[PDB]
């Protein structure tokens, strides 16, 4: 029950690392999904592969 | 970056290759010579489009 807005990651570079498995990058914004669950967490450098 | 379908502010602003694109990719460290001090401004690229 909101409004995402990702075309604040392309107009101001934040993240380093962005990918998308099951998903295109640039569609995010143009194709919207009902819930979205986010988890947020710390690792080791060689271990986020 | 470099490559075709790749997503980023370089395929996406200044430079890109076709999806279909047939070639070569090319690079190597220039590190010895193209830096100069603090930078080289002689090189200059599109951030924002």
Do not use: H, M
């Not at chain 1, 962005?18 to 967490?41: E, I, M, Q, R, W």
């Not at chain 2, 996406?12 to 690079?27: E, H, M, Q, R, S």
């Amino acid at each position: 029950n909101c409004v995402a807005d990702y075309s604040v990651l392309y107009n101001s570079a934040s993240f380093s690392t962005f990918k998308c498995y099951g998903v295109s990058p640039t569609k995010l914004n143009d194709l919207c999904f009902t819930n979205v669950y986010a988890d947020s967490f710390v690792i080791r450098g060689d271990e986020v592969r | 970056q470099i490559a075709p379908g790749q997503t980023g502010k370089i395929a996406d602003y200044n430079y890109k290759l076709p999806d279909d694109f047939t070639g070569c990719v090319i690079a190597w460290n220039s590190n010895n010579l193209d830096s100069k001090v603090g930078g080289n401004y002689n090189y200059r690229y599109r951030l924002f489009r």
